[PDB]
């Protein structure tokens, strides 16, 4: 029973979506940079050892097509026998490729493997690759499409989450990533973005605004941009959530996911293999689930792939030290809170997506080694990251510290 | 691949001009009017073999008809009669049609289409497969793919084109969605037609005309369309066309909340073959056409309603229920009686028709306002172009409004449009009697008194007969003719002619209490209200009312049937049988229309009902509705709450016919549709019965068997009755 | 860990690029068809102990955007827990996703998972997505780009494989695909496609040149399309192999992998998962491997990929008893043929891609499945599956009948 370790975590800031600073650059560039902080913090290590380069991306297509795993391991200059793989579970795939990582360590038939996520969303918007779920009408109309917002907007109507509730954890993400920032909690593994000539592009999360009041928030209409003001998805949503009379719209651009650009790398290998390269682990991964739940409300399968990582692992809610949840709107946050009964202080304790940004394939590498940092900067045991996902899926891992 | 499919007797003329333009004359001698059956296969297939084989001495093709209409419908009676064990024959013959229009196509010739009358649904098909289509602007004479009202779609060609000519959007959205029609005018500004002439007989010159231009001025464009050049650029752009792939996603949840869920196979088909067709080449794409196409024929659905929408109405136009042998009487003069929300629209649609009209009321203010309301209506066709200003001054013209009971000298056809009430009808008649012409039609709007009653109150019993309109009278499309016990057969095909002219469609129904409409759309509303005194949630009980397919959710309705009315008519419905010495058992909703009228909740009118009401606008549903009837605490599934609705209608349509009040599975159908809203996409209240598919089966005995599910779940009201079994 | 086995493995038939039968179907479709099939064999199974979908797709946009493999359980009614994941690998996603799926099992995190891919090459060719690298000409300059058949007309030009040597393989496989549909091999593994009224669209692989003749071949002017044929590219690869003068062009569209639709599924779960469910195992999964060599002859990455899954086994080259490489190209198989003197009647012994076609993301769980059902057949144990990959990799597996 080979188990699996993470022995680093790091990731680019997040650049925001308007005129922000990773526009200019590719995603490709942003993967191979976490590559040369990988080397520069190892310049030991054996690159022949790493057999894989797992990369989560959800828009796969220009800048993020042709297996952009596979052209950094290329243009990085890494052995040509450390592969190179795309995989897209929609806002999953960063942790799901953390989660594939560590189950091809535990098979025996891989070493050392890279793994994470990038996801230029100014270069790449959401939605640019196509599918049949959106444009294929006859599959469209059966499985009831609609927007992740609009199942957001319907999760707070169902629960009760009024727009002070949502906006009341969108204060408070913004105050404490805020707050971890000005701590120095990101300063080992936010690795700052620099040109071709050594110039620095961006090191900092741009999405923030650490001056957010309540105020602020309340003066902010309802998502009115993109896909869910096209018309009907209110009352595709209504026909099958039929007991409902009318879906408050809660959410806004203050109190959901940031749109930014990213990336995030995990190295993640035996204790063999580790030891091997003199490599220190930073934590184990315990195990991971994935479960779902309907698709039109969409963001609803996280509960369930919680409780399955749990049963596996053993544990419950009160063995678990941290928990970090995307934060892809308020509203679903929140709802997994009250499911689970989560300690207000033990959720999302660095702040989120709200505060930081959601670069779709990479969110769930970034939260993930969020939670390593956290966890060994408190000198806390245990910690469960989890991510809802469109068409109603949902990832769990949890990690224990070493 | 062949221009035929496998004694019909040929229905195209072939006429080879000097200078090598082939006029093909379509003329079935089988019928008035070019229908897309077995006959047109064989002989265009005949036709466009000789195009080919007389390429090198032909120059142009103009498609013409010798009929008053160019070319209307198709093989209704093979569709319908087509299995899902058919589906290959049904794709071979609409793959066959569209072979012989797509060489016409691209024969390197330019073709005409000398459109001289109605073109519709094949007919628009074969002129699109044209490269000009001239129209003569004559009176009648519509155009458009109404394939979609039959649960069909234009598989002959019509997805394929029109998203060819327009884009996705526009072709579904204003020809494919909806199957409308268009006069001349119209088909010339959206596209459909590209010149018109004054009269048919300038068409084929005009077509030869046009070919001898185009082949000098074009002769390299002569007889390739638009989709044929390379720098084809498709309107709206393709599906991976960015600008078009933002909101692509959209359509088909535009497409859920304009039929809120209920199901409607065709329009899914439709807009699924036109994107699907918008990604490949057009032959691809015709044949993707012509898979839906045989998806939509071979399902119960397009059956359901091709027996409605075209044996069933047809049958009824023909003068099904129009008693036999009974001859044409004109009407000069309408006397209307109220001129309240009924008798305004009355007015309005018989002074529409061409009919004078006499609207008295208690007053001439109220008079008045009652052809205020004609006014209003003009004045809104009027701005939007729907008609002209000296056909709007004639109409109105037609209403005098008066109080004066002397103003209907000369009247032949009274229809009474006042309270419901006994003995107020029975002077209000007897006050004009004498003074409207001694062959006057005696007509009483009532939706519950019987007519039997109301006609004792007038000397001349054999003319009193029921007219039951539907508000608003001016889009409502059904009148309900109720027989009384002395009402004539000719007084009866009286009434019957004169909805026919006013553009509505009649049923004929017995006297009894309820009649046939009010009596089913009662058991629907009283279904609903007792699902919410059961506890189940107002949300879902309107849900599954839009779901089911029905105009209005139900409790919707009841707000503005007014739920004062609907005790009325159930305390009347009590002593109809106890003090008729027999057994009544109060339905379930009773006690929940006594609670509301308790809390004074009875309605719209009133201002409160099951929904709030401000500024003449529902406003959502009351919220002290989940305490007053613990709403949620019953949770039965979607479907249960739908069948419910459906299943009490059409076991209320078959006692209905069982009893004698209607005559006709016709007009049961038609009756249900057109009368309360029962869904299309059924076919009818007693259409529903032999079409019914779910869990068990198809057909009648899988609807005894649902029944009997029902019946053990929900109370007996749901068993179906002797005539439904073995 | 846990032992991974094989209870179903189908795939549709092979439709033809230009006027193909399949090119009217949505490659969701394809994917939806062989999901019903699987329903057809085994009517009964939960499909709640489904824990995931995983196909390949090379091309990921259009038709086969927005995570193909999630769209076909939303679409085909399977529970909205049975996940849904899109991979990338190149020329091996399809045998990449039926390895990753075996490998879930054996981490014990997942019990039972469908594997395979789908590509529909006439409605999204390759290059479709675009390309992290032909988009970046930085990135290409660098890494030296060249595609697919100048590394098969370099592999020919440095092993002295002639263009009679080439067309001679490309004839052995029309025969053997030839004999193989006759004698009746696939009649219950290639599912027909039929449209929504049940009428039959295709039922063979209709790439297929039975007829096929030395003479013929002889004809074929050499590969003169898509991208080998605009300016460069020979300049380019023999600045890298400096050592060669000129490259022989002998790969045509005769003995090159067909452009071809089609999509292929595997049943994929532990032992318990197949007891439970009452499926008989076929195969056994005993090994996998990933490796790789130079991305500018690119296609030489299966002969380490080979020896590296024969020494993860414990077991060598003859005591394989039928060996599975995708002919991608002719001179690809004969350097595989050449370096581990793999017996010519064991080497690709039911046809391959030349005659059947080469469906990217598909093709890897084609040719596995194909080995299910000849192992089978002859009664034979062991049988070796591998594929080349574009980049320089390569992927191999071990299968053993059960
Ligand atoms: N193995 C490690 C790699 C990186 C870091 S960090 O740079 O402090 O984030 C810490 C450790 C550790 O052992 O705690
Ligand atoms: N700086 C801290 C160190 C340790 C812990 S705890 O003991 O894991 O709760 C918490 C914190 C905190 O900042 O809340
Ligand atoms: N009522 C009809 C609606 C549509 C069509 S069709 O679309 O031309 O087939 C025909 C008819 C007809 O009765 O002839
Ligand atoms: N404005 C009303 C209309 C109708 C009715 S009721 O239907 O007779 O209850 C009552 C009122 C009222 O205001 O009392
Ligand atoms: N037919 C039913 C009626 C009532 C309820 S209950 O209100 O949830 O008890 C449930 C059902 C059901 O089928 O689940
Ligand atoms: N009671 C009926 C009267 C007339 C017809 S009809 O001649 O088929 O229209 C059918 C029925 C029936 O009950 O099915
Ligand atoms: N969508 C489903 C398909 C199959 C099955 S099962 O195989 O009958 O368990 C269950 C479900 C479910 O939604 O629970
Ligand atoms: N478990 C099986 C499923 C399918 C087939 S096949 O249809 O003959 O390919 C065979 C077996 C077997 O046991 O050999
Ligand atoms: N029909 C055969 C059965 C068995 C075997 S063997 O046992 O793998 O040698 C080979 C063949 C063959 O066709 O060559």
Partial sequence: ?402 | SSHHHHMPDNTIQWDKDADGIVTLTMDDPSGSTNVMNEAYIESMGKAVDRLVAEKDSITGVVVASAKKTFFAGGDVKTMIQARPEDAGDVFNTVETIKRQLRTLETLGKPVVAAINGAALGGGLEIALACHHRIAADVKGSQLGLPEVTLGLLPGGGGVTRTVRMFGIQNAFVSVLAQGTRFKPAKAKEIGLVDELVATVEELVPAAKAWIKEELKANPDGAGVQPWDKKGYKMPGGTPSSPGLAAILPSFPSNLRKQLKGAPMPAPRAILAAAVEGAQVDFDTASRIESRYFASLVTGQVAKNMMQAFFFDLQAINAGGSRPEGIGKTPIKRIGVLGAGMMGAGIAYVSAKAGYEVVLKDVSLEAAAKGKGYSEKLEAKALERGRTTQERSDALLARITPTADAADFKGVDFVIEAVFENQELKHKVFGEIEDIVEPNAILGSNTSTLPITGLATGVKRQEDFIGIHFFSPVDKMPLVEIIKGEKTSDEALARVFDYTLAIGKTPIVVNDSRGFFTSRVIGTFVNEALAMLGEGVEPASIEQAGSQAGYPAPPLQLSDELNLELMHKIAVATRKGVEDAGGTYQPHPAEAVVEKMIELGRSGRLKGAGFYEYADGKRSGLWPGLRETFKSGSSQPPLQDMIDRMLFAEALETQKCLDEGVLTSTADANIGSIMGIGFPPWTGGSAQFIVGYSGPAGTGKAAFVARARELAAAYGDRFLPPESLLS
């Fill in chain 1, 1 to 402: 029973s080979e188990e699996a370790f993470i022995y680093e975590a790091i990731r680019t800031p997040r650049g925001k979506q308007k005129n922000g600073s990773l526009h200019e650059v590719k995603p490709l560039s942003l993967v191979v940079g976490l590559i040369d902080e990988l080397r520069k913090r190892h310049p030991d290590l054996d690159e022949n050892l790493i057999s894989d380069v797992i990369l989560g991306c959800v828009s796969p297509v220009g800048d993020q097509g042709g297996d952009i795993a596979r052209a950094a391991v290329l243009a990085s200059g890494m052995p040509v026998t450390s592969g190179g793989v795309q995989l897209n579970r929609f806002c999953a795939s960063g942790l799901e490729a953390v989660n594939t990582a560590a189950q091809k360590v535990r098979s025996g038939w891989d070493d050392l493997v890279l793994a994470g996520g990038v996801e230029s969303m100014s270069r790449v918007p959401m939605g640019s690759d196509g599918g049949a779920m959106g444009l294929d009408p006859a599959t469209n109309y059966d499985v009831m499409f609609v927007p992740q917002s609009i199942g957001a907007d319907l999760i707070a109507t169902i629960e009760g989450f009024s727009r002070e509730d949502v906006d009341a954890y969108a204060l408070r993400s913004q105050q404490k990533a805020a707050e971890a920032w000005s701590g120095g909690y990101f300063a080992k593994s936010v690795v700052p973005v620099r040109d071709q000539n050594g110039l620095l592009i961006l090191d900092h999360d741009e999405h923030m605004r650490p001056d957010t009041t309540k105020e602020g928030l309340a003066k902010l209409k309802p998502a009115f941009e993109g896909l869910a003001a096209l018309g009907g998805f209110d009352d595709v949503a209504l026909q099958k959530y039929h007991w409902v009379e009318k879906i408050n719209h809660v959410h806004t651009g203050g109190n959901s996911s940031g749109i930014v650009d990213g990336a995030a790398l995990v190295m993640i290998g035996s204790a063999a293999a580790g030891k091997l390269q003199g490599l220190t682990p930073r934590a184990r991964i315990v195990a991971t689930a994935t479960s779902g739940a309907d698709p039109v409300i969409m963001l609803t399968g996280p509960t369930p792939a919680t409780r399955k990582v749990l049963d596996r692992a053993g544990l419950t809610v009160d063995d678990i030290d941290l928990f970090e949840l995307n934060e892809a709107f308020a509203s679903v946050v929140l709802k997994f809170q009250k499911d689970l009964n989560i300690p207000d202080e033990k959720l999302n304790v660095n702040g989120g997506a709200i505060a930081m940004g959601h670069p779709l394939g990479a969110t769930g590498a970034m939260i993930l080694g969020t939670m390593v940092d956290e966890l060994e900067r408190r000198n806390a045991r245990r910690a469960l990251i989890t991510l809802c996902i469109g068409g109603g899926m949902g990832v769990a891992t949890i990690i224990e510290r070493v």
